[PDB]
From a paper:
Many important human pathogens including Salmonella, Shigella, Yersinia, and enteropathogenic Escherichia coli employ a conserved, virulent type III secretion system (T3SS), also commonly referred to as the injectisome, to deliver a pleiotropic arsenal of proteins into target eukaryotic cells. Chaperones present effector proteins in a non-globular, secretion-competent state to a cytoplasmic sorting platform complex, which sorts and loads effectors into the export apparatus (EA) subcomplex located inside the membrane-bound basal body. The basal body and the needle filament, collectively termed the needle complex, function as a continuous conduit for effector protein translocation from the prokaryotic to the host cell cytoplasm. Besides its role as a translocon, the EA also functions as a structural scaffold onto which the inner rod protein PrgJ assembles.
In the apo-state, a unique loop of residues 106-123 of SpaR extends horizontally out on top of the M-gate. Consistent with the recombinant EA from Shigella flexneri injectisomes, SpaR residues Leu110 and Ile114 (Phe110 and Phe113 in FliP) interface with the methionines of the M-gate below, creating what has been termed a plug in the structurally-related flagellar system. Intriguingly, our apo- and translocation-state EAs superimpose with a low root mean square deviation (rmsd) of 0.49 Å (SpaP : Q : R), revealing that in fact only subtle conformational changes are needed to facilitate substrate transport through the channel of the needle complex. In fact, many residues involved in substrate translocation localize to loop regions, which together with low rmsd values between apo-state and substrate-engaged structures supports the concept that the basal body rings and the bulk of the SpaPQR complex provide a scaffold to position critical residues in the secretion channel. Our data confirms the M-gate forms the main constriction in apo-state structures that shifts just enough to allow substrate passage while likely preventing unwanted transport of other molecules. (3) The SpaR loop, resting above the M-gate and blocking the channel, extends upwards, assuming an open conformation, which together with the surrounding Q2-belt creates an interface to engage the substrate. Six PrgJ protomers interface with 1 + 5 SpaR and  P proteins and previously unresolved lipids, together creating the atrium. The lipids reside in a circular gap present in the upper EA, where they function to accommodate SpaP α-helix α1 and stabilize the helical fork of PrgJ, together forming a nucleation seed that drives polymerization of the needle filament. Notably, the lowest monomer PrgJ1 has a unique fold, which extends horizontally, interfacing the SpaR loop connecting α-helices α2 and α3 before traversing SpaP1 to then cross the gap between the EA and the basal body, clarifying earlier reports in which this part could not be resolved and PrgJ2 was speculated to interface in alternate locations.
Residue numbers in the entry:
A (entry chain 1L): 29 to 101
B (entry chain 1B): 2 to 77, 84 to 119, 138 to 220
C (entry chain 1H), I (entry chain 1I), J (entry chain 1J): 2 to 84
D (entry chain 1F): 89 to 257
E (entry chain 1C): 2 to 76, 82 to 118, 141 to 222
F (entry chain 1A): 2 to 121, 141 to 220
G (entry chain 1M): 29 to 100
H (entry chain 1G): 2 to 36, 47 to 84
């Protein structure tokens, strides 16, 4: 369990760090800001990042939510 | 993912605290600890946050093998999808069948070889586990009811008819239970029923 | 009506079930109250000892009959109420 | 809260010695659910403290605490005095209530020996009916002198901050 | 599909937890289970999370046939016909409230049948019935409390309180009867008409 | 900063009152007080708000240094990572500060059984394996404090029968004697010191 | 019923996935995005998808909220 | 079923464990009745409570274990 | 007025309905108690047992009358409050 | 001040209103106790039956006065709070 | 804010003060009969309502409160 | 009455809106009506008036059920 | 390696950096400095929004343990 929860935390804490940086480097490099194909692809990465973090937040709140009504009654 | 797959995942993750409180063993675990407290006659010790804290942990050890084995299956026409989905529950359906009363299932199935239906299993399981907890609690009272009557015979043999005994048997009740290592016996035994 | 029977039946059962132990204690008490004059030796705790073994002995012997009666009345009222 | 906690517990003693807490506390309560004397005396002691202007003292200890102690100096309670706290609250209440308990025991002993002379006269009830009068008469006779204790003797003051707390713990 | 039909479809989905609390038999089931807990003298266990859950699942079997008959039906182009068409749908549910309510209450509410008169008349009818069941559940145990008290006074134990030893007797009796299996069956039989 | 490092902050502070109820010594201190009150006869003296207050303060002295140490460990900037597994082990190295505390009081045979049941040491086995030992330790420590009060009741009840004073109720008399005997001897100080000294 | 729930869910999921794909194929085909009459058909498909999935989400969640309410 | 065995044994236990004190308390009452004072009567009563603390322990913990064993398996 | 009558009648019923069972328990205790002063036998269980039988017979015979009285008062007060 | 005065009266009223019912209850208790020691009888329902009448009776006769005391004190304290 | 609260608490006391009598009196009378198991709250509740209805109740306060500022 | 006011209001309004959009769609599909300012000028009025009607009835229905949540949940 | 993974993975807000910014402060400058201000304007609005909540959680957790 815990040895499995530690793996989940670390794997996601790194994937978001790398993904967030990838968006930044695509927006400061000129050949990637002003080309429609590279603009089209950046529109995807931005939205996919937004959804991924929103989902983790929801599912975590529900985890520490079901614990409230069962322990405290 | 898929749009309609989110809606199914989100609704389920909302109803977790009700499913665990009705359909999972947490029902059996939570009651037995409170009956032990009352058999000793303690009013506040340990706190409901303590006991409910344990029942919720010991239950996770028992249920996790089911959720892990289920996740791998979903990660791995209308008639094909429904049949594919059902095989994922078979790992859970089996668990309910093992304990749920054989006749109640048929009785509710008629109100709604036939493989049982979960909606028939849930109420048949909830009601069947409760009965088993009341049964266990009954056995846990008999060793102390002997203690309570025995003490009264001593006071009466000394005539102290208005020396109400309860002060004297309360500490005996504790010596007995810790000399019985009760909290360890119950925790080891209660889990072995599900292994 | 159905209510009066069930309400009246309850009070009757109380006398049937509680009767025997009060008799067994009394019948034993009369022997000690008398024997205190035959032996002409006295300690007031004497009745509390002997009466106890009469009641406990009767309960052990009757523990079976006491159950069948409660299990019949319990079922009967459930059927009457829900029907 | 110390001045209030003392007056409250003072009530719970009187309610038991006079009246009822269930012998086995199976219920467990008896009297009212916070037996009514201990709720009355708790309220009474509070109203007088405000009238003497005590409210300005409560806010005073707050501002001083921030000057003798502040979060970046890691203020911390003193362990040595904290260990004694519970005895002080118990001792203060025990002494103040004493005048009303002693007469209750003496009166029960008065009736107790009478049940040597009139034995089947019931020991218990004739004391239980009576105690609820003797407790009230004797409280009224001392109701006035209890007020001075709340104002000066038990009220906390900003001078105590020097010993209960220490910084960099 | 039309906007006004949809607005009425969204709004009913807001009011669901109230109609099921007043207009449906759920009131009998929820009450009966709590009275069982009180008769045994238990005070926190089983949780209201469980009793309010099991009672809700059992009540679902009884109502499902009524909702499906409205499911299989559209639940036509004129005010009179449209009223008749919409009104004819609710009539599948009207036949339910009227079977479990007293004529005298409805008649008073018909004068200030209509659905609005049936809802409050139905609620009071189910509630009073629940207390009529609870009463019967106390009788088999109160006799046990009196019997325990009666014998101890024979032993001279003026003030050994009963509860420390009578509470287990209540459990064996309820378990030996398989109470939950009898109550959960008899309750649905009043409605399912199996 | 890092978003997953933010979610963990909010989750933790949401769970904190349930962690203190099991994975902390608060469990033992508060329990022992309520049993001693219970045996003294009078009820709600001290008020419940006293007992749960001091037990909460006294416990912070033992746990707060451990918490502070856990955060100061993660703040070192000199660490570097090269793989997912390298991160997991680095995080785990932080919890050893707390684990070592639980390992001391938890009994070996409980943890080993849960560590096997866990399949098909781990903290999730040390929480329930710890909670059960801190409960049990209190019923022992308390039972020895009932002996003197039982003696006091038997003595006075026997005295009453020497005076030949039947059907007086031997509770009015003895309740106040227990308090005077216990309060005049500063029992609450000796009790509180005896608890902290086991862990400090 | 569970026997019917699997049926109601299954049909919903498949019918939606087919529609999403169809629109995508209408955007990559140059003969459709360049033709005004083919665009008018596509505009309707885009809207119809939005309103259906939104209705399922709302009505489902209010069905869950009716259950939550009665249990607390 | 076990419910009947476990229940009958309890009644059998009380008869014996409560029987012994009243018989000996009777005989001792008779002999002393036929035949500092507080100090002596104090030792006399406390004396039998110490002696019986042990023999009762070996019994009850043998019954307590057995009803737990029956209950859980 | 309507307040005094209802408050006064409440105390009246308590005295009447509780009166009968306490008197019979009292009368039985005295007559059985006097016998214990006549005979050389003394036992607490004898009067207690006999009292229960007399009290239960009292509740059985009067059970019906106790019902009408409580319903009449219950009805009257509902009309006084709502009128 | 207007607080200690108002506080004193609350304790004073308790002693006044409950005084007579507790006094009469006390005297009646002693009488039955004396009459018992005069004879060999021993009964415990007897004192309750005699006291029940006396306690209910005195309250009944006094009920009219209690309202006079309370309705004046209630107005008195309300004026001090708002004057 | 602190000033209104202090004064509001004083008003609360005088309104509580008359009902204390009813609780302490009813409790004492029960012990007179030896009904130590009865729970006064079930009996003293109607007495409190009767007193409040016999007084002018909320009409006294609402007028008195406004007159302090009018 | 009260029980039927909902049928009259629901049924009466549904028919009035259903026919109004139908008379709009076919107004934008007649060569004489889509290409004449006198026909476009009226269509600007017609299409906006429908928009306001549904917005008001939708809003007030939500406040109706909102008061029923408030008075019942609290 | 992909990126310099280090201890910057283990904190929510970079309080030592934000403190560095708020000492920079004792009209507009456009568009370069107008862009940088977007960070310092938002990073401080979010930090406060957390602190308001952790105290409410932390007080409430004390009150939960005392109620029982």
């Amino acid at each position: 369990l815990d040895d499995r929860l530690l793996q989940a935390f670390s794997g996601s804490a790194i994937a978001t760090a790398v993904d967030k940086q990838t968006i930044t480097n695509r927006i400061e490099d000129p050949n990637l800001v002003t080309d429609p194909k590279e603009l089209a692809i950046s529109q995807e990465m931005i939205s996919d990042y937004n959804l991924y973090v929103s989902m983790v937040s929801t599912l975590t709140r529900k985890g520490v939510g079901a614990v409230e009504t069962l322990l405290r009654s | 993912g898929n749009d309609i797959s989110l809606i199914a995942l989100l609704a389920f993750s909302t109803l977790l605290p009700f499913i665990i409180a009705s359909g999972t063993c947490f029902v059996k675990f939570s009651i037995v600890f409170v009956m032990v407290r009352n058999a000793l006659g303690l009013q506040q010790i340990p706190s409901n946050m303590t006991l409910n804290g344990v029942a919720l942990l010991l239950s996770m050890f028992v249920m996790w093998p089911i959720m892990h084995d289920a996740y791998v299956y979903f990660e791995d026409d209308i008639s094909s999808l429904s049949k594919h989905v059902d095989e994922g529950l078979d790992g859970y359906r089996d668990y309910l069948i093992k304990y749920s009363d054989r006749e109640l299932v048929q009785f509710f199935e008629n109100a709604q070889i036939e493989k049982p239906s979960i909606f028939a299993l849930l109420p048949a399981y909830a009601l069947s586990e409760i009965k088993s907890a009341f049964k266990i609690g009954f056995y846990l009272y008999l060793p102390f009811v002997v203690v309570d009557l025995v003490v009264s015979s001593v006071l009466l043999a000394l005539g102290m008819m208005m020396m109400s005994p309860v002060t004297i048997s309360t500490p005996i009740k504790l010596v007995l239970f810790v000399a019985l290592d009760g909290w360890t016996l119950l925790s080891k035994g209660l889990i072995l029923q599900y292994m | 009506d159905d209510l009066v029977f069930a309400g009246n039946k309850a009070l009757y059962l109380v006398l049937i079930l509680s009767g025997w132990p009060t008799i067994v204690a009394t019948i034993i008490g009369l022997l000690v109250g008398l024997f205190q004059t035959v032996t002409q030796l006295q300690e007031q705790t004497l009745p509390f000892g002997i009466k106890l073994l009469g009641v406990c002995l009767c309960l052990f012997l009757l523990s079976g009959w006491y159950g069948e009666v409660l299990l019949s009345y319990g079922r009967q009222v459930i059927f009457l109420a829900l029907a | 809260s110390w001045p209030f906690w003392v007056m409250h517990a003072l009530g719970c003693i009187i309610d038991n010695q006079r009246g009822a807490t269930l012998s086995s506390s199976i219920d467990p309560a008896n009297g009212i659910d916070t037996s009514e004397m201990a709720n009355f005396l708790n309220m009474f002691a509070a109203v007088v403290y405000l009238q003497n202007g005590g409210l300005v003292t409560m806010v005073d200890v707050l501002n001083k605490s921030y000057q003798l102690c502040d979060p970046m100096n890691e203020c911390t309670p003193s362990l040595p005095p904290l260990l004694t706290f519970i005895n002080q609250v118990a001792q203060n209440a025990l002494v103040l209530a004493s005048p009303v308990v002693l007469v209750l025991l003496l009166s029960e002993v008065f009736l107790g020996l009478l049940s040597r002379f009139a034995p089947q006269m019931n020991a218990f009830a004739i004391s239980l009916t009576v105690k609820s009068g003797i407790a009230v008469l004797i409280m009224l006779l001392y109701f006035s002198p209890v007020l001075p204790d709340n104002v000066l003797r038990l009220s906390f003051q900003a001078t105590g901050l020097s010993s209960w707390f220490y910084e960099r713990g």
